Amino acid sequence: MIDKSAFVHPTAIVEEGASIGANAHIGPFCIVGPHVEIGEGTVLKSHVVVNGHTKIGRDNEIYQFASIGEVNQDLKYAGEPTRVEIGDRNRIRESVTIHRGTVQGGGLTKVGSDNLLMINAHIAHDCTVGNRCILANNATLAGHVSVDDFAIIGGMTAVHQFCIIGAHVMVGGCSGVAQDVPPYVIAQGNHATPFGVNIEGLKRRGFSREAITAIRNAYKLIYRSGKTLDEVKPEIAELAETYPEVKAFTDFFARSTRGLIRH
Amino acid sequence: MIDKSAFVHPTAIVEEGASIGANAHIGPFCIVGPHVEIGEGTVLKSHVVVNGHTKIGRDNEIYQFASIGEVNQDLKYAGEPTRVEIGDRNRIRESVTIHRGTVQGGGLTKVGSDNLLMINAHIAHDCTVGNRCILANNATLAGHVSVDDFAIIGGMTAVHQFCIIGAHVMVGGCSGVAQDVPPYVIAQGNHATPFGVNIEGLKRRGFSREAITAIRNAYKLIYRSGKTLDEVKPEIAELAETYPEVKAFTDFFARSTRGLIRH
Amino acid sequence: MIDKSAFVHPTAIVEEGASIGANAHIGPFCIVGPHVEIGEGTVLKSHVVVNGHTKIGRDNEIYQFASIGEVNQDLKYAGEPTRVEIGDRNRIRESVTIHRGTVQGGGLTKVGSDNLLMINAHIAHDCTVGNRCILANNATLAGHVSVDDFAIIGGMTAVHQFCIIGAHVMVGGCSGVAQDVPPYVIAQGNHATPFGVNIEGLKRRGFSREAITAIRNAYKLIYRSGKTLDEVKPEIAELAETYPEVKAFTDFFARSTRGLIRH
Ligand SMILES: CCCCCCCCCCC[C@@H](O)CC(=O)O[C@H]1[C@H](O)[C@@H](CO)O[C@H](OP(=O)(O)OP(=O)(O)OC[C@H]2O[C@@H](n3ccc(=O)[nH]c3=O)[C@H](O)[C@@H]2O)[C@@H]1NC(C)=O
Ligand SMILES: CCCCCCCCCCC[C@@H](O)CC(=O)O[C@H]1[C@H](O)[C@@H](CO)O[C@H](OP(=O)(O)OP(=O)(O)OC[C@H]2O[C@@H](n3ccc(=O)[nH]c3=O)[C@H](O)[C@@H]2O)[C@@H]1NC(C)=O
Ligand SMILES: CCCCCCCCCCC[C@@H](O)CC(=O)O[C@H]1[C@H](O)[C@@H](CO)O[C@H](OP(=O)(O)OP(=O)(O)OC[C@H]2O[C@@H](n3ccc(=O)[nH]c3=O)[C@H](O)[C@@H]2O)[C@@H]1NC(C)=O
Ligand SMILES: COc1ccccc1C[C@@H]1COCCN1C(=O)c1cc(-c2cc(C)ccn2)n[nH]1
Ligand SMILES: COc1ccccc1C[C@@H]1COCCN1C(=O)c1cc(-c2cc(C)ccn2)n[nH]1
Ligand SMILES: COc1ccccc1C[C@@H]1COCCN1C(=O)c1cc(-c2cc(C)ccn2)n[nH]1
């Protein structure tokens, strides 16, 4: 159902069954499939393709030549009715591609809220992008990648399938990420290696001096102590008993499947 | 001539003279020039530009914002009526560009069958892509490049003009290929260097244990023996007398103009 | 005002107030905003978005899926009426993005004349591209970058914000530029470092033997003498008293804010 306060440009093609919310705007030459839901106030500027079983929240801005909900590039995909979920207040720039999930991978590609996906960023099948993330131009996620809250990924950088980009991470431009990046870490290179804690990002986001110090000490446990990851896991959990921000490492370790990036 | 069983969307613009085969589908806002031939069952999803003297085979899937047959980017090109040929059952993803040839380069850009060209892959003027290849997102071929059968090129990787990517090669992502890559080789880096035989690919494609061993021995002749390429050419031909798969090296050497990638 | 000799395709949408010059051509499914000026003979092939306060000169060729004048990607931008200027005889290829300025950065993104901007090149807010430049496929400028006359930037290369790419520079493909590149220099790598003078480019552009020798001697002062930049500045100015081409270094030093690329 198309809300009476939505604008649908006369040249756009909205298939019967699409749901278009109040004060949304579907610009010229857009295509919107019959299983799409577009939330209140969301704007498709022009020349946007949205299809598949795809739910888009409110106050998004989706620029021309973006493709949202499209069939993914996994050769294993066979046309099964998988899904895309996109939250609120995202800025999704020209030529961005966000592809539907695979049955094998859980059936869902998900993007949160308040993200900036720059020109030609790619969100593959079964990826999970959190909130307040930035993907710079041409940043490219293979299938099943997680980009956790507040993480940023620089221009031209690509991420190998299943890798986790931890919360508050900064991945430099011109980099290739082949393993998991712990929360709060700066990573750069081909393949990417760690370069300390993202102190400036934490400072800007209201982390206390004590929390940043604890996070730096956890980083030192992982990368400077010389111990195995199995030895440091209980030491990190111990530190988190006092500084709850350090728990993000514990939560990340439980999800990590590819090992950590290392020098 | 447009086959009576083809679908041409009312918003598409198919110029008089275009040939559109049985059960093909030209989606909304596509443009098809007067010297284009589109084979039986091929689908242009929407927002696709096809022009030039361009022949496209059967059962292709061409996604939105692709540009097929377009004027190439060689400053030497002056508008001469050069050509593109594309075979059957290719998946040509969003924003892929496939450009027409140059008179200087032979007049023809050619793509075979059963290829997967991921988002924003670029096939420059006078390139030849074989069958069953994969170009991942943003993989970029300069002019005159050959990508031989079953070769795969990872995300963000670019290939310098005239280079040959040999049959069954795997080029990693985030790489820059500046010289020729022999068949059956894994290559990675900036600039790309060899990392042994693509054993897993050969195994999956039905190569025998004996053939893979011979191919590994040929690789050792090239990269481990310490001899010059001129010394090993007759030794590789000798080995091919028993194992015909090794002949691919001989055939490749005859085409190679840029020297081989090396450690 | 639309000149009576301009062609505007019936499917294009040109907003009242746009200025379209004599013998210009607005192809199918283009969108042209009300503050756009398109000069005499310029061609928008099809599927082009031009908006903002954007002035485009004469005899340009702008290919499908380009976005010219669009809102920039700087989070600081708040919708202020900033500008784009583009000169004459540019070739602006598929999917190129050229974004409007920011108030903070001076309000203007500017591109000169006779440039070739290959597929998916990106010109961010407040950039200044000169004349006769080449940006190869996916070459990506962050905000405020200068690309000076005749400079060329290879495929997949990105440039960090505020950097200067000096006149007649050649930046290789697959590179990441993080500091300023003096005129006449070859740069390559991640991050890019200098590799001598672009002798072949200067030769082709009519520089004399004496001028190229002086430029090589200036390069040696900067990178081989072992002196500080402050010591060599007056030595370079002294050399320019005889060879005026060397003054380009002096002019560049005065603009440089990020330090020079170095080995
Ligand atoms: C330095 C880091 C650089 C990172 C660059 C990343 C660029 C990503 C671009 C976006 C891609 C995304 O949209 C889709 C995606 O990631 O799909 C894959 C899917 O996430 C995965 C898991 O579910 O499965 C697939 O990848 P795999 O590599 O696991 O697939 P495969 O085992 O089928 O191998 C693919 C091809 O490689 C060949 N191969 C494989 C291994 C080997 O050793 N040699 C070889 O030739 C093999 O013959 C086959 O033709 C999927 N692929 C394909 C082509 O189906
Ligand atoms: C680590 C590997 C990275 C690989 C990155 C590859 C990215 C490829 C992107 C797709 C490009 C493709 O669509 C088109 C293409 O490859 O065309 C060229 C064509 O295949 C070639 C052969 O036929 O000829 C041309 O390339 P060349 O480099 O040989 O051309 P040229 O000799 O005219 O030089 C181009 C410019 O470089 C300048 N130059 C050249 C040499 C030098 O030493 N310094 C210099 O400044 C020269 O002044 C001129 O302005 C063609 N180019 C141009 C701009 O005309
Ligand atoms: C090896 C070289 C690789 C180069 C790759 C370049 C790819 C460029 C792609 C085109 C981008 C272009 O269209 C737009 C652009 O460049 O905009 C920025 C604008 O030119 C700049 C100056 O005016 O200002 C901004 O960049 P900054 O990096 O200076 O911005 P910021 O200080 O707001 O930081 C951005 C984010 O990074 C986080 N941050 C910053 C520093 C740090 O140490 N850690 C960290 O997490 C911070 O929390 C914030 O969320 C602007 N960005 C944003 C996102 O607003
Ligand atoms: C470090 O800043 C980041 C990092 C990650 C994600 C976003 C940004 C913001 C900047 C500017 O806003 C546009 C996007 N940006 C970039 O992609 C980006 C990367 C580099 C870079 C620089 C160096 C020296 C090394 C590696 N990478 N320079 N700019
Ligand atoms: C190695 O897998 C390849 C290689 C070439 C071409 C295609 C693929 C398939 C994968 C997944 O399907 C999407 C496309 N892919 C990639 O582009 C790709 C490259 C890398 C990579 C990883 C490492 C560690 C080093 C270099 N490169 N990781 N993923
Ligand atoms: C060196 O040639 C340049 C350089 C800068 C800008 C444009 C060009 C012209 C070429 C061909 O015309 C298409 C665009 N090109 C490229 O992007 C380009 C880069 C490399 C390369 C090669 C090596 C060995 C190292 C680094 N880079 N090979 N090709």
Q: How would you write chain A as a 3-class SS string? A: CECCCCEECCCCEECCCCEECCCCEECCCCEECCCEEECCCCEECCCCEECCEEEECCCCEECCCCEEEECCCCCCCCCCCCEEEECCCCEECCCCEEECCCCCCCCEEEECCCCEECCCCEECCCCEECCCCEECCCCEECCCCEECCCCEECCCCEECCCCEECCCCEECCCCEECCEECCCEEEEEECEEEEEECHHHHHHCCCCHHHHHHHHHHHHHHHCCCCCHHHHHHHHHHHHHHCHHHHHHHHHHHHCCCCECCC
Is residue B43 domain-shared with residue B104, that is, in the same domain? yes
Is residue B30 domain-shared with residue B54, that is, in the same domain? yes
Tell me the chain C residues in contact with residue B175 when contact means C-beta distances shorter than 8 Å: 174
Resolution (angstroms) equals 1.7
Residue B125 known to be catalytic: yes
Residues C239 and C250 sit within 8 Å (Cβ to Cβ): no
- Does the CB of A89 have a partner CB in chain C at under 8 Å? no
Q: What is the CA radius of gyration of chain C?
A: 20
Is residue B134 domain-shared with residue B62, that is, in the same domain? yes
CA distance C237 to C79: 43
Residue where one domain finishes, among candidates B147, B171, B196: B196
DSSP C115: -
3-class SS of residue B1: coil
Q: Residue C217 sits in a domain of what CATH number?
A: 1.20.1180.10
Sheet with A97-99, edge to edge strand ranges:
A13-14, A31-32, A49-50, A67-70, A97-99, A122-123, A140-141, A158-159, A176-177
CA distance B94 to B47: 10
Domain of residue A212 covers 197-263
Instruction: Specify which residues C53 forms β-bridges with.
Output: C83
Residues B142 and B158 sit within 8 Å (Cβ to Cβ): yes
Using CB atoms, pick whichever of C31, C75, C160 lies closest to residue A28: C31
Residues B144 and B105 sit within 8 Å (Cβ to Cβ): yes
Nearest ligand 1 atom to the CA of B204 is 48
Is residue C122 domain-shared with residue C232, that is, in the same domain? no
Burial of A191 (0-12, 13-18, 19+ CB in 10 A): middle
Instruction: Give yes or no for residue A161 CB within 6 A of ligand 5.
Output: yes
Dihedral sign of CA atoms A34, A35, A39, A40 in order: positive
Residue where one domain finishes, among candidates C167, C196, C225: C196
In this complex, the chains that touch A, judged by 3 or more CB pairs closer than 8 A, are B, C
Sheet with C140-141, edge to edge strand ranges:
C13-14, C31-32, C49-50, C67-70, C97-99, C122-123, C140-141, C158-159, C176-177
- Of B123, B59, B116, B126, whose CA–CA distance to B93 is shortest? B116
Is residue A91 domain-shared with residue A12, that is, in the same domain? yes
Q: Residue C88 sits in a domain of what CATH number?
A: 2.160.10.10
Is residue A173 domain-shared with residue A256, that is, in the same domain? no
CA angle at C65 for the pair C61 and C70, rounded to the nearest 5°: 90
Structure tokens at A254: 């439980």
- Of C213, C217, C234, whose CA–CA distance to C225 is shortest? C217
Is residue A147 domain-shared with residue A209, that is, in the same domain? no
Residues A104 and A75 sit within 8 Å (Cβ to Cβ): no
Is residue C18 domain-shared with residue C96, that is, in the same domain? yes
Cβ C137–B122 below 8 Å, yes or no? Answer: yes
The H-assigned helical ranges of B143-183 are none
Residue where one domain finishes, among candidates C196, C221, C237: C196
Is residue C117 domain-shared with residue C1, that is, in the same domain? yes
Within 10 angstroms of residue C25's Cβ, the number of other Cβ atoms is: 18
Structure tokens at A124: 């593959």
What is the identity of the amino acid at A128? T
Is residue A203 domain-shared with residue A138, that is, in the same domain? no
**Total structural domains in chain B?**
2
Structure tokens at A243: 């500084």
Burial string for C72-110 (b: 16+ CB within 10 Å, else e) reads bbbeebeeeebbbbbbbbbbbbbbbbbbbbbeebebbbb
Mutate to test the interface with A, among B47, B61, B94 (most CBs of A within 10 A): B94
Q: How would you write B48-101 as a 3-class SS string? A: CEECCEEEECCCCEECCCCEEEECCCCCCCCCCCCEEEECCCCEECCCCEEECC
Residue C160 known to be catalytic: no
Using CB atoms, pick whichever of B70, B75, B190 lies closest to residue C174: B190
